[PDB]
Every structure is written in C-alpha cells, then in structure tokens.
Amino acid sequence: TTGRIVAVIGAVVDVQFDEGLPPILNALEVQGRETRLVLEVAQHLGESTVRTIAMDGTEGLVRGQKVLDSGAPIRIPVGPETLGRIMNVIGEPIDERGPIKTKQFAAIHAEAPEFVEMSVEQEILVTGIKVVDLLAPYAKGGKIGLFGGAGVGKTVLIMELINNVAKAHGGYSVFAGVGERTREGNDLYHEMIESGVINLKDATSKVALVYGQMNEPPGARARVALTGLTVAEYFRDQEGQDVLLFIDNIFRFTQAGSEVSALLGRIPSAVGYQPTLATDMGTMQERITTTKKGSITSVQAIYVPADDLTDPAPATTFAHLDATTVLSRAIAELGIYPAVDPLDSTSRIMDPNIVGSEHYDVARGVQKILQDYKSLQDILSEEDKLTVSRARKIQRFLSQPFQVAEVFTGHLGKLVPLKETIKGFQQILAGEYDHLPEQAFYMVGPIEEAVAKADKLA
Amino acid sequence: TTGRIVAVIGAVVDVQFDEGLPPILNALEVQGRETRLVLEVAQHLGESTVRTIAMDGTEGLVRGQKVLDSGAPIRIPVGPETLGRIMNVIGEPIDERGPIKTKQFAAIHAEAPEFVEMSVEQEILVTGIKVVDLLAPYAKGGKIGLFGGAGVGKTVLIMELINNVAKAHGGYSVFAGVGERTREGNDLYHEMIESGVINLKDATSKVALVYGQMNEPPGARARVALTGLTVAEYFRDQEGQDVLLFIDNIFRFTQAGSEVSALLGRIPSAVGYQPTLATDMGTMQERITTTKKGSITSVQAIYVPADDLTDPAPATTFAHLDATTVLSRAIAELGIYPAVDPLDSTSRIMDPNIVGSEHYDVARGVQKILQDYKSLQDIIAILGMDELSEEDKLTVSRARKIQRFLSQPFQVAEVFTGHLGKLVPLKETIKGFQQILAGEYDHLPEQAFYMVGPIEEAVAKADKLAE
Amino acid sequence: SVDLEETGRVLSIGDGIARVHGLRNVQAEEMVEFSSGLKGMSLNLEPDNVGVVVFGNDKLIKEGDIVKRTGAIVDVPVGEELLGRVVDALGNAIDGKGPIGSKARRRVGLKAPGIIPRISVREPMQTGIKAVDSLVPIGRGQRELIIGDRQTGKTSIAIDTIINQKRFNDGTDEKKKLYCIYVAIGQKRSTVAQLVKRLTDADAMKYTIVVSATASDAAPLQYLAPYSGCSMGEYFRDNGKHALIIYDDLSKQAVAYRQMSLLLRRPPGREAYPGDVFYLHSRLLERAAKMNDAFGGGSLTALPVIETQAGDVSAYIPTNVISITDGQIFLETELFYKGIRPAINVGLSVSRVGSAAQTRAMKQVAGTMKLELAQYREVAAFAQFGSDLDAATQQLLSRGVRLTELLKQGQYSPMAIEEQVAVIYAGVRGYLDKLEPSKITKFENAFLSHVISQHQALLGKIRTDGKISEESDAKLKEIVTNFLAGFEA
Numbered sequence A: 001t002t003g004r005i006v007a008v009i010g011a012v013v014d015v016q017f018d019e020g021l022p023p024i025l026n027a028l029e030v031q032g033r034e035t036r037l038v039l040e041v042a043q044h045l046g047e048s049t050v051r052t053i054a055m056d057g058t059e060g061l062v063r064g065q066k067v068l069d070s071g072a073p074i075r076i077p078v079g080p081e082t083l084g085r086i087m088n089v090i091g092e093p094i095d096e097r098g099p100i101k102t103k104q105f106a107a108i109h110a111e112a113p114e115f116v117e118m119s120v121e122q123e124i125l126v127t128g129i130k131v132v133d134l135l136a137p138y139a140k141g142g143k144i145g146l147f148g149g150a151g152v153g154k155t156v157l158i159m160e161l162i163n164n165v166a167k168a169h170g171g172y173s174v175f176a177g178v179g180e181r182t183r184e185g186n187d188l189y190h191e192m193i194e195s196g197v198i199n200l201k202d203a204t205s206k207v208a209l210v211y212g213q214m215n216e217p218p219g220a221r222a223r224v225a226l227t228g229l230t231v232a233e234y235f236r237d238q239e240g241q242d243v244l245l246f247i248d249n250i251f252r253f254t255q256a257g258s259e260v261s262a263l264l265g266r267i268p269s270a271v272g273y274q275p276t277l278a279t280d281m282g283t284m285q286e287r288i289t290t291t292k293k294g295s296i297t298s299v300q301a302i303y304v305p306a307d308d309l310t311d312p313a314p315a316t317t318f319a320h321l322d323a324t325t326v327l328s329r330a331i332a333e334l335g336i337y338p339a340v341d342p343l344d345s346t347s348r349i350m351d352p353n354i355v356g357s358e359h360y361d362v363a364r365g366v367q368k369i370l371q372d373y374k375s376l377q378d379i380l381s382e383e384d385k386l387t388v389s390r391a392r393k394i395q396r397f398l399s400q401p402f403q404v405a406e407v408f409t410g411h412l413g414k415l416v417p418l419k420e421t422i423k424g425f426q427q428i429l430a431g432e433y434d435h436l437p438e439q440a441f442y443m444v445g446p447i448e449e450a451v452a453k454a455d456k457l458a
Numbered sequence B: 001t002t003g004r005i006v007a008v009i010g011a012v013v014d015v016q017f018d019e020g021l022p023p024i025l026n027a028l029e030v031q032g033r034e035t036r037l038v039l040e041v042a043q044h045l046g047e048s049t050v051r052t053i054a055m056d057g058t059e060g061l062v063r064g065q066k067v068l069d070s071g072a073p074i075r076i077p078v079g080p081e082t083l084g085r086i087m088n089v090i091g092e093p094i095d096e097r098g099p100i101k102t103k104q105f106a107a108i109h110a111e112a113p114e115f116v117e118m119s120v121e122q123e124i125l126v127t128g129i130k131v132v133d134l135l136a137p138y139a140k141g142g143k144i145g146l147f148g149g150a151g152v153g154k155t156v157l158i159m160e161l162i163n164n165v166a167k168a169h170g171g172y173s174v175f176a177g178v179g180e181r182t183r184e185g186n187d188l189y190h191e192m193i194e195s196g197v198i199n200l201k202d203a204t205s206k207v208a209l210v211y212g213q214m215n216e217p218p219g220a221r222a223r224v225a226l227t228g229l230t231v232a233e234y235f236r237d238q239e240g241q242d243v244l245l246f247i248d249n250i251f252r253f254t255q256a257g258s259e260v261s262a263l264l265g266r267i268p269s270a271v272g273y274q275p276t277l278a279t280d281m282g283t284m285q286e287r288i289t290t291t292k293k294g295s296i297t298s299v300q301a302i303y304v305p306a307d308d309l310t311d312p313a314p315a316t317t318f319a320h321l322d323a324t325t326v327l328s329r330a331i332a333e334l335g336i337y338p339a340v341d342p343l344d345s346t347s348r349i350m351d352p353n354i355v356g357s358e359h360y361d362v363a364r365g366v367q368k369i370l371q372d373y374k375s376l377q378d379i380i381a382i383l384g385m386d387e388l389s390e391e392d393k394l395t396v397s398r399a400r401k402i403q404r405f406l407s408q409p410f411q412v413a414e415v416f417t418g419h420l421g422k423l424v425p426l427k428e429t430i431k432g433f434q435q436i437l438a439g440e441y442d443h444l445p446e447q448a449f450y451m452v453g454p455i456e457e458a459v460a461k462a463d464k465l466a467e
Numbered sequence C: 001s002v003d004l005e006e007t008g009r010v011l012s013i014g015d016g017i018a019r020v021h022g023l024r025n026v027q028a029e030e031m032v033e034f035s036s037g038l039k040g041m042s043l044n045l046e047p048d049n050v051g052v053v054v055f056g057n058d059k060l061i062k063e064g065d066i067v068k069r070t071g072a073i074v075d076v077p078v079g080e081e082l083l084g085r086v087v088d089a090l091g092n093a094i095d096g097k098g099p100i101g102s103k104a105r106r107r108v109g110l111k112a113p114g115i116i117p118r119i120s121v122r123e124p125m126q127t128g129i130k131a132v133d134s135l136v137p138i139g140r141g142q143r144e145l146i147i148g149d150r151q152t153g154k155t156s157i158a159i160d161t162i163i164n165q166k167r168f169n170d171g172t173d174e175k176k177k178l179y180c181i182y183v184a185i186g187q188k189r190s191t192v193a194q195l196v197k198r199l200t201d202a203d204a205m206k207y208t209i210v211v212s213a214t215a216s217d218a219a220p221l222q223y224l225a226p227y228s229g230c231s232m233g234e235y236f237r238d239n240g241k242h243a244l245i246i247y248d249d250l251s252k253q254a255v256a257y258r259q260m261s262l263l264l265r266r267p268p269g270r271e272a273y274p275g276d277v278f279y280l281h282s283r284l285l286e287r288a289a290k291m292n293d294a295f296g297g298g299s300l301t302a303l304p305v306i307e308t309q310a311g312d313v314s315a316y317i318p319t320n321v322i323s324i325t326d327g328q329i330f331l332e333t334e335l336f337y338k339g340i341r342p343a344i345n346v347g348l349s350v351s352r353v354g355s356a357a358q359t360r361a362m363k364q365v366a367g368t369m370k371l372e373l374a375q376y377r378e379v380a381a382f383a384q385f386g387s388d389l390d391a392a393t394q395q396l397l398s399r400g401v402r403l404t405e406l407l408k409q410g411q412y413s414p415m416a417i418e419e420q421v422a423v424i425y426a427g428v429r430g431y432l433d434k435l436e437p438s439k440i441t442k443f444e445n446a447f448l449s450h451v452i453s454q455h456q457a458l459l460g461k462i463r464t465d466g467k468i469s470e471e472s473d474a475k476l477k478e479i480v481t482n483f484l485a486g487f488e489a
C-alpha cells in the first residue's frame, strides 16, 4: 500500500505507513517523479514509520509525497540479455539501448550459500595467462586482490580474463563499477566494444556491466556490488557456469558503507569506518563462492589507504582474498606485458596438495632463480652466470601477447593452456634451451612458438 | 522592553520576554547589579526566550531577575578622545581618569567592507628585523600575522614592532589586548607613558588601548577583539589616516567561542572547536583590512595550541594574512631569537617585481641553503661529518652561520638577552646575507654571527673571540 | 486565517539555522524567503519543522517571522555577458560595473552527463608549466587536482593556466579557444582583489568569469559557489565551446558545508564531516566532462584545489577529492624552499589520461624525460654520499639534476608548447651535461629570450612539423653549444 514521506534529510527519507509496514531491505518507489527514485528500507523507527536510504537525489521531494511498497528488495533484470548491456544499481539501463528484455527478475539482497552447498574441492580456474597460472593461480570461487594503479594494462588484463575464461571454461563475466568515474565508465565500455569482449550487433557479449557512479548517493555505491553479484548468481545457479565478477573498487564498497552507516546515525568505529565493517564485507564476499552448480570467482581492485596494509579496510578484505595479482610500473617500463610482478603476486592454492606436484616444484624454481638474479644485479662463477642467462629468459617467457591487444598492438593473441605453462618454464630451468638465444622468449604463446621463432631466425 | 532570567550555566544566560523579544547581537542590561553587566543575545531558543552570553561574571544572578533591552548592539566610544585611554569590551574606562569624553558611539558589530572598497597597494614596511625584512617582509596597509606556540616570542616581537614602527608614525594606533596577561597590559601602558606615545595631560596621544584579558570570562574575550577594531574603523573611514592595529592574541577570540559552544547547544567540530569557526573568524577578520577610504596596517599575534599549526584556529587564520611570521619552539630552544622559522614564514610582496631581484635572489638563496641543510642534519648526525663532500660541508658551515645571522637582539628583549638592542637597515641586511652566501666569511668562526645587528659586528666580534 | 502549507513561522533561529513551523508543501533543497528579505535553503524537512540554512547575517531573522515560499528556482545567470565580471555566489555583480546583461539561466544543482554523452579526452589543455604539460598532462574534459600545504603555489598553477589561454583566445582558431572560470571559496576580499588585478594586468579577464564567496559571506553561499560556477561552465560545454573551471578551494567549501550539517544536527563522522561529503564533491567534479560530437563536442575542465595539513594527503577530504579526480599535482613545502618552483613532486603526481592529452611534439620528448627522471629518483638518495661512483650511476645522477632544473620555472610567464619542447630536448639529448647545475635556471631564461628574439622561424618549424626534425636537431645543436660556452664564462 501507499505510505507517506514524513521526513527528508539529505539522502535519508523517513516514510510513514498505516496498514502494513515493509520489512528491512525492501525497495520503495516514489510516486510523482519524472525519473525513477528507489528508496531502500533500513530501520523500523517505530509508530508505523521506517527509515530508508535513497538510491538517487532527493531534491524536489515534499513531506506527504506518495511512496509505494514494491513488496520485495531491489529486483533487477538477470539472464543472457544482460551481457553487453550497462545497468545501474536498481537494474535500469543506462546505455540507452531500450529495456533489458529478460524473463527473470532476481533480488539483489540474497542469502549466501549454506554450509551443505559448499564445495570442499580445491579446484583451479585456468586463466590462460603465464604469469598468473604458474605463480599466482586463481582458485575457483575465490577472491583475488588486483593491486597497482591505472596505466599498466589493468583494463587490458580484465578484458583478457573475460576473453580467456569465456573460451575455455564457457563462463561469462560481470563488471561491477563500485564508484565508477563516469569518464572511465565511457572508456571501459568502448574499449570492450573495440576489442571484441562486448559485441553491439550480435549476442556474443562476454560481460554484463553494472555501474554505480561516484556522483550517485551512498545508497547507490553501497548496493551496486550486490546488483552485479546477482547477475553472476544467475549464470552460476541457473546455468552451472564458472563465472567471473570484477569489482572496481572494493575500497569504494567499504567507503560507501561507511558513508551510509554515518548518514543513518550509527556511531563510527576505529579510523572512522562503520561498526558493521566486517559484516558488510562478509555478507557480500560469502556469496562469491563455489557451489555444486558452479562457481563465482572474483577479481577485486584493492586500494590501500595511506599505504597502510594494517588499516581496517585492507585488513578486513584480506581475510577473503585467496590470491594476489600485483601490477607494476617497474615491470611495465622493462617492456614486459602483462605488467605483473612475479615475486609479489602469490596464491593460497599454490600448494603441492592442491595443484599438481610438477606445478609446485617448477614454480618454486622460478621464484628462487628470479630472486637469485636480483641478488646478482647488485654485482661470476659458472652457476651464477648460468642463472643470469636463464633468469632473463624466464622474465621474457612470462610475457604474453593478448587477444584483446590485437588492434592495439598488431601481434596475434595466444591462449596458453595449463600444462604448456608447466612444461615451458621447466625446460628452461632444466637447461634444454640454454643453446637457443634470449630474444625468442619475448612475447610468445606456448614454448613451441619460441622454438619456431628460433628455427625461423637461423 | 523588560524580560526575566530563566537559566544561568557559566557564562551562558537564558532570558524570557513576555511581549517584546529582542533580536540577535542586541546588548541587554542586567538590573540589580552594582557593576554594569551586559548580555549579548546570541540565539533565539523559542517559546519567547533567547540565549545570551555574559560580558562579565555571572555570579550573583538569580532566576526571575529583571533584564532590560537596549534596542541596539554593544555601542562603544569612538573618536580622538579615546586616544591615551584604556577601554574594556563594553566601552568603559579601566584607567581611572573620568569618563571617555565623547558624544558619538559605534556598535561593535558591523558588515565588513565590500569587494569594490578593496585596495591593491603593497609597498614594503621595513621593520629593522633582519629575518622578517629578508625572507617575508611586511607591507604598509597590509595584514600581518605573528604565529607561534606558548612562549616563543610573539609578544616580544609585536612590542618590538611597536618600538620600531609605531613610535616613528604620524597617524594613530590601536592595541587590542584580547585574552592575554593583565601584567603585560600594565607593562605596555606605563612604557608608552615613558616614551610619550601616551600623554596623560595634553591630547597628543597616538595609541588608544583596549583590553579584555584572561582574567575576564569568555564573553569579554569573544568580543573585546571586535571592540578594539571598531575604534580603528573610525580612524580608518571617518578621519582618513594611517592606523596601526595591534592585536594580542586573536586566537583568544576563537578560543572564547569554543568555551561557550557546548553550552549554546552545538555539536562540536574537529579538535573540540565550534562548527562556526571559519564564518565567525571571517566576519571579524574581513573588517580588519585596508580599503579605499583608509589604510590599516594590522599586526595580529596568533597562538598555536600544542605547537600544532594544523590546529583549526591557526590553520584558518593563514588565509586571512598578507604576510606570516611563524615562530618555532625548536628554534627558540637553541637560543636563536627571534625564533622565526625561515622555511615557513612567507609574504605576498616577496616578488622580484615588488622588492627587486637582488633582494629576491638572496632571500631564496638563504632558504635553499637552510632547506638543504635541514635534510642533511638527520643524515650526518648518524653517518658523521667526514662522509660529506667538500661542497656539502661548505654549505653546512655557511647554513649554520646564516642561521645565527638571522638572530637579533631586540631593545624590548634586552632584559632576556643581556645584549644591547640593534635595528638593522634593509640595505645592510641584504648585503650581510649576500657576503655569507658567497663565502666571504668562511675563514671567520661560527659564533661571531650569533646575536649581532649588522654584518660589521660579526667581523669585530670575530676578532674579540681570538682573545 | 493562517496558511501553513505555502507559508510558515520561525520557531528558533541561531548560528545561521532557522527551524520553521508549517511549510508543508516545500520541497527538499528549495529556496524560501524570510520576512526580512533574506533567503534560505530548506535542507532538513522534518515532521514538526523545516531546518532552513540562512543566506546572510541572521540578526534580521527573529522568532515568529513569516517564512514564505516563492517557488524560487535556485539558479544563476549564464552566458558571454559574465566574461570579465567579478560576481558573488548567486551571480550578482560585486565589481560595481552595472548589472549583468544575461539572457539564459541554468540551475546550480543538476546531474552530470552519463556514460553515453561523453567521448575519451583527446584535446590537450595546455597550462604553460613544463612539469605539468610534459609529465602530468591535462586534457579538455579531465579533472586534475591541485593539492598541497599552505603557501606551496597551488593558486599560481591555476593563474598561469588562465594566463596561458590568451594566445589561443586572441588567435583565429575557434577549436583551441578556452574560456575560464575562477571560483573563490572562503578567501578574503583583498586576496581576490589582487587576483583580479593580476589577471587584468595580463589581459586575461576579457575571457575569465570570477565567482567569489568570501570569508564574510555566509556558509550556504560558500556551499553553493562552486556549483553556481559549474553551471556557468556547462553552457560553454553544451553549446560547442570549451571551458576551464578552478575551485579554490574545496577544502574551505567542505568546512562551510560541515558547519550547516553540524548545526542541523546531522551525524558527525571522521573529522566531524557528514556522510554525504564525498557525495558533495563527486556531484560537483563529475559535471566536468569531454562531450562527443552528437551533444556538441565541447568540454569542461576542472582544476580543484585541496589544502592539506602537514602533508597529510590521507586526511578525509583530501582522500575524497584524490579518488574522484583523474589526476593529481602534489605540491610540497620541502621542494618549494629547495628551489623546485613550481614545487611539483614528479614521482607522486600523475595524470591517468596521460599521452592522450598531448601533441606529438611534446609526446616525443616527454616519454624520454619521464623515464630518465625515474632512473634518477631511485639513485638520487645517494647522489652526494657516493664520490667513488661508476660511470653508469654518474650519468643518471648528472643528467637527472640537469633535467630537474629544467622543470623549474618563473611565475606569471606560461610558455607555448614549441618553447617547452626545445628546452626539454636540450636536457634529453644531453647538451647541458657538463654545465654547472646551479646556473641552469639562469641559462634557460636567457636562452629562451634568445631563441624567441632571433630564431623566430625555428620555433615555427617545431609547431608546423609536430616534432624536432633532423633539420631542427642540427640547427638547435649549434645554438646550444655556442651559447653554453659563452654563458658559463
């Protein structure tokens, strides 16, 4: 039934009802508005009144304006039609290509999978990339910390992970812009079009886009991660896929939560963060997990405030991360692509029990020899000079040309399967390609192309 | 109209009116008091009631006690008959020389000069203080701010400026003693009678004193700053004359606001201050200015709680100033008086188009050699002097001599130093730091530059230290 | 009778907050009118009253004063009539040069353009400062934060940027013309008087709109002043043209907005600011944008200012505006007094747009210079503490000190792109490697006057060809090496 607005303070609207009050987390539509204004319920204050957080600007609202209970949380379009489309936190299309014509409507507030549903199997999401799969592999239904700023192929790494996982595993992806810069929302959209991961003319789109832009209120940026998470929950639950969920930025999810908590009048915790910081994180992160149907793996952009790892935001987030992908400018300026720091990037599933025995020992040799090279850079014997030649070739062979960067660069993109990556670096450490030169390993797919490059240039 | 007191909690007093409710800023006169007790209306609470703050102590006040409304804000004496006399916040004599013999009064609250009234002249005002004139010189008709922590030489500096600038000055002056020491008011008052700046007999007095010291409650300290500048506002506009407006200490205006802010029913802002810090500072500081109609050269002492310049009070004050002299406890601790920070004090007029390139290039050369030395200090304390290059330990030796040549014995500070007071002209200041930069006194020892006036005294003192 | 729907009465007034009984039909953020003439924005709609922030001195508002609606649209005048006028927060003139002859008007509070109306930032926005245009390049549409402590040169960067636009606005090419808007929030009037005199002296005011909410003006006028000026810049953006806006500064705007939020009793968070302080600045800054051809092709470029405290860039309000903006120009106190002026930290300053907002002339020398400075900044910590150093590090240490001195620059003299690349090129190809490091700033100032005076045709080649060609390489090589031996003697 229709309830009345009894107070408006910034983006915090109080709504009175008569017959039946809506529960917490329900979406309320405001009547007599030109654009759609959703109010999410937060607190039952008492005396038939509820406190809500507005998902859009509250300018123009009068005391006594009609507010209609939808009878459920924020329900948003889910399906294959979401792929190649941009939607806001409340499900509306913001790419101006008409309504998103799906045959389901999923709620964004959904309980995490039960204990019985949990997959005890420690599986490995084969990304395709050599730097990742060898040294910092992505666990299925896990979370990965994507460190490093922009201008080091961050958006290019995202697009290739969408490209490669859609090919091999047959799993689509989702991008959740939690506090998206509207300029960079434009750039990511059109770069995905030009590469091929988005397709505007036919339905071969490999990503659903969900933007909660920075100029929107705290309510918007708080819940937009849950909206994109629900789009991924369709592909996992209903169609059994191993899904990707890109969240950018996870600190802005924490930040938006800290803003909402403040607006509602809750007393802050240490360092100004909301007292519900661990739960706000936990209720979101526990949905990103493996089930019997499939999985939702998630790459998450980590911003570390004040370069302090012990700050509440990073510390609470690292409880959920199964791995780290550290982008670097020092790696980029030496001509290596992707721009991943091999020693800094690590994984929990990097274990001889979890992944292969041959996987763990060969990758350990690369981690050893790269540090031995970094020791010798400060400065030799037969073993020292042999490692310097191999370690440089290991740094070259870690680089890879991407399918996303074909029109960007010119060179052809190559998806490298798992065991090709194991065998390739193993033969370099064993010393089978000590005869061949160094430049063959620069920008290649598997090690067969490096030998083919050596056979052609001879 | 008549009202009645309904609450008294410290300096904050609530008053209820049956019929005529008085507006904000109006002075209310409390009846049944031996001495005069003003209450300025700060807020309107509702239910025919207003919240006020007391200009004197509230002890003795009873609920239901009668209060009359003046129908105007606090109106004080203005005109040349104020000269030589000591006023308080509400415009009464505290010097015991009869009433202030004038028939014209001005309200302490008033709108600040408009944008069209602003001037853009900024010629140098040479103090005779080496560090100030060299690195961050003051301008005539310009706003000057003396920052510093507790006990680093803000008052000793402001009195020396009165000694050097105010005595050799044709126009009038105003010293606003806001929330500092009654002892220092006594010291100044009788020192100016000695020098003939105040004259008890004839009407030739240049300075008009206004005092609301730390013995007074917050209402006095929150408004006596305004009282003092309203005297200077008359000498600006109506006369048309160069006024010197000394204030000591203008932090106390903002501090007095923070003392009552809790009792006015306000949520506190960062570091315990009132939310209305910058807006309350703004409507006060914007009045302290030079306009088309008259020139004010305003020197303001600014206290810095816990020696933290990031504190909301001093942090907000910076933007209101054309020249800033920041003092440090770290520098005073080493005996370097005046303890000015050469890598923190600044001015608008420090430009090669205003003070000439020869001045400018020496001032930056002094800041560079000091700034380069500041980074080294911490490195060469551990790793030792002998690891430095010969170019570096040249710049270390020169920096340490330059630090000492920035020090100066004031006349007002003769009782602390034990050295005779010295005034250094701008020409000999620039030449002094020019020669030390070039290396013309590398042969001379370190301590000869410490606590001397011109560069010549260093050469003479260097020969004295031989035996 | 009493109309409690369209009018009301004041219950309490104090600290620029008026609680108003009645006013049932008022909207959120709606401007109402008090009995004494003063206006007021309805920020808190509560059940029993309206919390109205007062626009001016609140001695004129009393208890039982009639607050009235007037259906007042909150807007400011916009057009070309504001160009060269100093106005207040609501677009009223404060320069005393009559009224504004404005025709169109625009609401102060409007949403930014979404994803679709924009295009990537391609057009460069030239500041004239070498360290900015080369290493921290800004583009039309971009939002570049100027940040640093008090007295670090924050405004100076904005002023030279405005002064740099005279050559484009005097030229015939309408595409390069950039109109300017300076917004002063919380400053004193004599500072703004000096600032308009500075711009008039450089003949900059004929294309510059100055919006000024000073310290004596009430908090709501400081709160609105950036938004008012933003609407002025949007008209140029929408109607084909390009615009530049300076918010000086958002720190002082946040304090004004905090005052209102604390006295309206909204919950105080970190540093006593409200939960919507990020929502505040992100709303403002997002309205700066690079439009595509369909909606116009125009642009609005934001240069916000943020005063840090003791270099704490992690403070709440600096943390907000850093993350919102496309890039940052970090100014530091230690660099300023070291001789680095403008005192821009190269290592920490960043432009996320980058090369896309540069010409090929600048793009050639900038990438090479950026790399060599990175090689220096690692090695520079043991520059003095070395002596017995190998030739590899001695090359980086020598070259790096030379290049740092070329980043130094005078105030009020913004340079053309062809003049900058010539100076950087001398450093990159290493003609100044044996020159004494202390005499580079003086060397450059005379060298710049010489190449402008005599070799005016040479600067024409670099601007026409879009690079330093082999002909210019050899021609410039002769001019440096002869001037170098003559100057150092």
Ligand SMILES: Nc1ncnc2c1ncn2[C@@H]1O[C@H](COP(=O)(O)OP(=O)(O)NP(=O)(O)O)[C@@H](O)[C@H]1O
Pocket: B148, B149, B150, B151, B152, B153, B154, B155, B156, B157, B180, B249, B303, B337, B338, B339, B409, B410, B413, B416, B417
């Ligand atoms: N120029 C100077 N020469 C010699 N001694 C000085 C000088 N300046 C300050 N001192 C010494 O330090 C004391 C403090 O100076 P004063 O000017 O009272 O500091 P202040 O900053 O005004 N303190 P406060 O107002 O309490 O915050 C003086 O009384 C002297 O003993």
Ligand SMILES: Nc1ncnc2c1ncn2[C@@H]1O[C@H](COP(=O)(O)OP(=O)(O)NP(=O)(O)O)[C@@H](O)[C@H]1O
Pocket: B318, B319, B347, B348, B350, B351, C149, C150, C151, C152, C153, C154, C155, C156, C157, C341, C342, C409, C410, C411
């Ligand atoms: N490139 C430069 N070369 C020489 N002097 C400069 C330069 N840039 C700034 N200055 C000087 O440095 C001082 C401070 O510059 P300003 O632009 O006022 O910085 P600011 O941080 O905006 N000041 P404030 O707003 O008071 O904190 C002025 O006196 C300028 O003349």
Ligand SMILES: [Cl-]
Pocket: B355, B356, B357, B358, B359, B360
């Ligand atoms: Cl000079």
Ligand SMILES: [Mg+2]
Pocket: B154, B155, B180, B248, B249, B301
């Ligand atoms: Mg003192």
Ligand SMILES: [Mg+2]
Pocket: C154, C155, C156
């Ligand atoms: Mg400034």
